[PDB]
Design a protein around this ligand. Sequence first.
Ligand SMILES: COCCCCCCCCCN[C@H]1C[C@](O)(CO)[C@@H](O)[C@H](O)[C@H]1O
Ligand SMILES: [Ca+2]
Ligand SMILES: [Ca+2]
Lengths: 853, 87
Amino acid sequence: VDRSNFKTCDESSFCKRQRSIRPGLSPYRALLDTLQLGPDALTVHLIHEVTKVLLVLELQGLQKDMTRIRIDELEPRRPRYRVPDVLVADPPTARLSVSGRDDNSVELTVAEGPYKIILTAQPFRLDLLEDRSLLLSVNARGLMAFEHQRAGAWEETFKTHSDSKPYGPTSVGLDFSLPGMEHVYGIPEHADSLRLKVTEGGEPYRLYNLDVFQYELNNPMALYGSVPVLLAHSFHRDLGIFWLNAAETWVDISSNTPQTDIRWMSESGIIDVFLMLGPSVFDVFRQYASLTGTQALPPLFSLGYHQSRWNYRDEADVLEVDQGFDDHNMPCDVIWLDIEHADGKRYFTWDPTRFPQPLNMLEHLASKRRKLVAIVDPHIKVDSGYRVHEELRNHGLYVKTRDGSDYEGWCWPGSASYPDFTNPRMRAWWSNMFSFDNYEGSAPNLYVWNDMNEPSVFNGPEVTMLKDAVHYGGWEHRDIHNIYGLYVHMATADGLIQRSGGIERPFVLSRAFFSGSQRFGAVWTGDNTAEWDHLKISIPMCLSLALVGLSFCGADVGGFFKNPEPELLVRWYQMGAYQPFFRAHAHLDTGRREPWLLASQYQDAIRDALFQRYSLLPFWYTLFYQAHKEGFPVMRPLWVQYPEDMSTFSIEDQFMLGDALLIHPVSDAGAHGVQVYLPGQEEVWYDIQSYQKHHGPQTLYLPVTLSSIPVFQRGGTIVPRWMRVRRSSDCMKDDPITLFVALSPQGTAQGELFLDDGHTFNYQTRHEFLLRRFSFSGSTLVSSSADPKGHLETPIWIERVVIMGAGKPAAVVLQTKGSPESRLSFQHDPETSVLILRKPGVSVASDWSIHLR
Amino acid sequence: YEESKPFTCLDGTATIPFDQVNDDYCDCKDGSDEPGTAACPNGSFHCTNTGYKPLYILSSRVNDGVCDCCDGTDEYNSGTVCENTCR
Ligand SMILES: COCCCCCCCCCN[C@H]1C[C@](O)(CO)[C@@H](O)[C@H](O)[C@H]1O
Ligand SMILES: [Ca+2]
Ligand SMILES: [Ca+2]
């Protein structure tokens, strides 16, 4: 495979320098005479004992039990980069106190305890404790390295590309020790296993947004996005490390009583790291969310099914695809237009022959209550007849080279320039370009796909921009690389909001991403391949993104490259139906694979998967509201829900949605069954197809057929469904709800439901929403408000209750505030212990209770 | 005074009271108790369509906001007003 066009660590000169420093006695030491306790931080000088370089450590305790460590030069020749726009706020601090000291150490207490930080002077070292329990150490292996800005370490070439490297060696690095941790996770994006591997005998994990053609599986090469967040889990605690650096970064992981050591090595910027002390993984989720924000609440339609390919050829094709879904009784919310819809890959334009009347095409889709997504990439064709290019050139908004000319590289339209999305004036220009007057042919049901925003540069080093290109404020491209795509995502999402006057929630899919990208929409795992192992790896890839806050994740259903055999396509639909971002997509040269083109047995299996997804939309929507409000991931590893079950710490052929559904999709050709691990002491699980109850913990052998999607509902949960599947989610969002109550062994259950208009910010600006709590105990099901601030005018009502694990009552009695007591009819299956309550008929906005007598 | 009589599911299977016909809840395995609503997954809605050909549509397209019949009668309580287009 052709990987010589991507640097290994040995070919990255700063990585080679850093990684050659091996564990030993650190030359850095803290000058305790310089110690100062301030309003927000402790500052103390550090010195390299041999070079006498002076650094400043800024140490802070933060509210929510986190620590921030920043290290910069005391007297720098010029400022180092500090990552902007990723933190949503200046983190609230807690007061540090000197609570102990000797000749070689100072002990600090965060607020009034229980967290303590021991600063050792010689050699420099930090220890983080809760009371007397050591949580984590910093520089314990003496791997700290800080190359100060001096007056291929300098000028450097790779392949035929030359980096002038005008500032010389400036790389920074630091190691962390996690006593008691044997399992670490995160730092996407890699086509690798959920539990991260030791790097001792190979390459570090690389974080550098890059476009890797036909990327392969189980390897640590950098892919399109970079989230520098690592989670550590043991039976006893959870911790997170957030390395806030936007430059090329390499991560070494080593194991050693059990202990995992983590080392970060970055090309430039300062050392800026957050330690998130848990103790539970949900505490870590909250800690990280307070720093970088939460998943933007998707408009409801974007949680439906998306039909895409490169490329639908013209307006007639799009309308034939739209009509095909209806003629074959298959739901779909969005049809996508890839780059061939534009005029020669000039974005914001339309091909004058194949898309001459885009407003009319959009009106036809609106009459079917469907949406369209158009692709808009950040490379702008160098073309004096192209108004976008002329405006950006005339206003000086392009990334520049050192000699002051606009950077020019190669992409889809041929020669192209790259707007400087780090410049706030450029982002404002971009957002205004999405106004309905500027983006001619767009309409409120047209949303956006940002691709190639690493940025991809076909004739650039590693298929990206030169390191020494120059951005706003004079920063080099090497300084900002990993947030370029995030800025594209951000400016596009703001454009869709602004064009509506601030009312409509955006939908933007982005390929490249960074910490904070969850605020701006969805991501996907790029150009996968139509093969069974790529189907399998979608779970650990989206799980690794979920753990670091990017909940709106998916992979191309069917695979982007090559033609999937029909059985694989069926299994990929079933897999994708239970993943957050659900889009079929395909390469230009693949055969057409709209789902009604297959033989009827495959069509029926795919239709069944689509129906299951649409029915679960109220559940998906509520999980995403909880992600938006709390920072909790939608798709979850089993170990997040069972932190003490060590046999779950590596599982990646199964996952949870919230705490209620466990999914084990079939991912092998010709499979006759699957082995489902059902966790939980005293837990029960219900097969949602057969209603068969199963106790945990066990590995259940479950026979499957082509139409099987192994899904289990956990005892103690209530899942809301729309059982009336229609052609799109807009058609369903006023329909009645069916509640699926899965009884715990104690005869209890609980769940939530969020409802709003499905597409605006009115839930936030006007508190126009409902959050209901449904709870079952004794023999009574009760609906109450989980947030009284929310009211909503809605016709949604409760048409049905399905209770699993219940005996046959003598009578069923409904009480609603404002109504007389009513009697409900019911059906009971003694074989399955399933109770169906007929037509409660009560508004979802009303308090009510149902009693089984 | 003498009272009236109930409804019987076309597939046999069941017999339900008269007031559970078109009561917006599916009581019949073949969907026959809900010819005029969206309540049954296998039901059908009949569009008389005077001036053109009569048409059956899926029950799921009754009051879905989309005009499925030229006479517009599938949309009677959805906020979509369908003009008669049977020409
Ligand atoms: C014979 O083919 C003509 C030239 C071959 C070039 C092959 C390089 C394919 C990889 C491109 N990936 C992109 C761009 C994209 O293909 C179009 O925008 C999207 O579909 C996709 O999702 C995204 O990741
Ligand atoms: Ca009925
Ligand atoms: Ca209709």
